[PDB]
Amino acid sequence: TLLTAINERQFRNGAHVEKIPMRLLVAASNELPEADSSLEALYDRMLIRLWLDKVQDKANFR
Amino acid sequence: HPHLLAERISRLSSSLEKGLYERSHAIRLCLLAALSGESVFLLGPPGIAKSLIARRLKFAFQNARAFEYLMTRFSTPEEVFGPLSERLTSGYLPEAEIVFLDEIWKAGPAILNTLLTAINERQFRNGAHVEKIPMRLLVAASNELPEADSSLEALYDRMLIRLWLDKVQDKANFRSMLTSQQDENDNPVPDALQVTDEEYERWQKEIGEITLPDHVFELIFMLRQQLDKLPDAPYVSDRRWKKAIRLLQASAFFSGRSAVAPVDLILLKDCLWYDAQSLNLIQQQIDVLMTGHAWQQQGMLTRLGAIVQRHLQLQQQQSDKTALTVIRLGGIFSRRQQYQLPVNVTASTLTLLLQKPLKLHDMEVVHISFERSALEQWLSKGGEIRGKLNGIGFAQKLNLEVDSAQHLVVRDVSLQGSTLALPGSLPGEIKQQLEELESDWRKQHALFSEQQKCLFIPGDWLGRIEASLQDVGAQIRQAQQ
Ligand SMILES: Nc1ncnc2c1ncn2[C@@H]1O[C@H](COP(=O)(O)OP(=O)(O)O)[C@@H](O)[C@H]1O
C-alpha cells in the first residue's frame, strides 16, 4: 500500500479513492535491506539517500 | 467496416505512447493481449516503466479496474485474492480487468496453485460456489529467471508474450524522456477511442473465425521442425503453438484483414524464447525465415540460378558461330606482343566461354571470366596469368597459350586443347522463364506493400524485409541485359 501513495498519490479507501497531499516523505532506520528481498522496491523509489552519524567536532558536542 | 477498425486501433495506441519513449513495442503488444484474453511477461531491471504499462492499459476500456501488487516471500492469499469473513474480494483479483504482479518467482505454493485456475478456467474457488473472473489482461514482471527444476516453471510455460525490457539507448530519445511534463497518472485517451464492454465480448468470437491460409501453415511447420533438430534450440510445446495463433489471428483482425498474413510471424520472437541463451537463437531463426521463405525470397533465388545455368548452357553450345580472333601489332620488341579487340570488348571483368569442357582443379567449368587489366600484360610482356572458374572462387593459374590461328588454348592435366570464345550479342526460352519469375516477384512485393502497416510490427524489422526483397529483384534484372 505504500507504493501506491508515492506513484498514484492516492489510497484505496474501500470503494472510491482520494488524493493524498503528501509533501515530504522521510524514512529513517539503522541497517540496510537485503540485496534479494521485497524491501528493495521502496529503496529504489527514494530519491535522496543521506547517511547521518553522530557529532565529531569537540566544539559542536559541548 | 473491417477497414475502419485499423484506424481506431492505430489511434488508440498513439495516445498511450505519450510520455513513454522507446516503449512502442511494449504498449502495442499489451494492447493486443488485452483484447484477446492472453498474457504478457516482462523481464528486466527494476526501473524501466514496467508498472506504468500495467496502469495505462486500464484507460482503453470503459470499465476497467487496475491492481498493483508486489509478491513477497511471505505473501498470503488473503492479501491478493481478498480476505475471507464469504470472501471480501471488493477490488482485488476476481473482479479486476487488469492485474499486475511484480516479482512472481518468489510466491508461495498456495498463491501459485490458485493462479493457474484463473487462466485456463478463468474461475476462482470462492469458498463454496465458483465465479468467473473478467481478467482481460495479465501482466507479470520481475528481474531474474526462475529455476529449471522448480514449481515456478508452470506459470512461465503458460505466459505467451515474453518481453525483455531494458533501459533507453538512443541519445535523442533520452533528452525528451528525461524532461517530460506529461502526467503518468492522468487520462490521455479520448472517450471516443475507448472500447466498451459489448465490443470486447463481440471481438472474442471473431478472433477464432480467422481463416488459416495454406501458405502460412507451411511456414509454421517449417520453423517448428527447425528447432527440433538444433540441440541449443528451446523446446516449444503444443500449448505455446496453439496460444500463439490467438495472438496472430487477432493481429490481422485489428489491422483490416480477414486471414492470417505472413507478416504476423515476427510476433513469435517474444514468445518462443525463455532465457538469455534462447534470445539470440529465436531472433536469428525467425529472421532467416522472414527474409527467405516468407515472401519467396529464398525460393526465387534457387529458381533464378537455374535460368542463369540454362542461359550459360545455351551460350556454350552455340559457341561454334563466334570465334576469338587476336589481332597483331608491329613495333620493335623482342617478344611477340599481341593486342586484344578494341571497341568490340570494353568490360573489365568480361567472361569468355569455351567449346569442349575440361576438368580444371578436379572440377568442371563452362565459362572463365578474365580481367581486362591482366590480359593486356600477358598478351604483351608474357609470363603467367590467373583466372577464376565459373565466375566464383579465387583467381587460379591456368595453362593459357597462343595458337597458330590467333586463338586462346586452355590446357589441363592431360594436355587437352580448348579454343576460347566470347559470348555474342537473349534466347526465347530464357526470356520466357525470366518473365514468369519477374511476375512472381512483383506479386510477392505487392502483398508486402498491403500488410506492412500493421501496428503490432516493430519498425526496425521493416528495413530488413525491404532489403531482402530488393536484392532478389536486382539480381533478376541483371540477367536480362
Ligand atoms: N523507459 C522509460 N521511458 C519513459 N518513462 C520512463 C521509463 N522508465 C521509467 N519511466 C518513468 O519513471 C516513472 C517510475 O517508473 P517505475 O514505476 O519506477 O518503473 P518500474 O515499474 O520499471 O520500476 C514512471 O512514471 C515512468 O513515466
Distance CA B347, CA B349 (A): 6
B454 CB near ligand 1 (under 6 Å): no
Q: List B residues 46-85 in contact with A (Cβ-Cβ < 8 A).
A: 46-47, 51, 55, 68, 70-73
The residues that bridge with B139 in the sheet, in sequence order, are B40, B100
B52 assigned ligand-binding residue? yes
What nine digits make up the cell of B114? 490458485
Distance CA B380, CA B472 (A): 41
The pairing of strands B39-43 and B137-141 is parallel
CB burial readout A26-44, b (16+ within 10 A) else e: eeeeeeeeeeeebeebeee
Chain B residues in contact with A37 (beta carbon < 8 A): 73
Cα angle for residues B418, B369, B313 (degrees, 5° grid):
65
- Give the contacts of B136 (CB within 8 A, at least 6 positions apart): B34, B35, B37, B61, B64, B97, B98, B200
The separation between CA B283 and the C-alpha centre of its own chain, rounded to angstroms, equals: 8
Distance CA B280, CA B93 (A): 36
The pairing of strands B386-389 and B367-369 is antiparallel
The pairing of strands B351-354 and B130-132 is unpaired
What nine digits make up the cell of B341? 579487340
In the sheet that holds B420-421, the strands lie side by side as: B392-397, B386-389, B367-369, B351-354, B420-421
Residue A5 distance to chain B (closest CA, Å) = 12
Distance CA B37, CA B200 (A): 10
In this structure, the number of other CB atoms found within 10 A of the CB of residue B383 comes to 6
- For residue B167, the CA-to-ligand 1 centroid distance in Å is 10
Chain A residues in contact with B47 (beta carbon < 8 A): 44
Contact across the interface for A38 and B72, Cβ inside 8 Å:
yes
Using alpha carbons, list the distances in angstroms from residue B208 to B131, B133, B264, B392: 24, 21, 16, 51
- For residue B347, the CA-to-ligand 1 centroid distance in Å is 61
3-state secondary structure of A14: coil
B27 CB near ligand 1 (under 6 Å): no
Most B CBs within 10 Å, among A1, A2, A4, A7, to test the B interface: A7
B52 CB near ligand 1 (under 6 Å): yes
Chain B residues in contact with A3 (beta carbon < 8 A): 68, 70
Using alpha carbons, list the distances in angstroms from residue B69 to B98, B152, B216, B385: 12, 18, 40, 77
What nine digits make up the cell of B232? 541449443
3-state secondary structure of B362: coil
Using alpha carbons, list the distances in angstroms from residue B458 to B3, B23, B52, B375, B455: 21, 11, 21, 51, 8
What nine digits make up the cell of B129? 460456489
3-state secondary structure of B297: helix
Cα angle for residues B316, B317, B322 (degrees, 5° grid):
70
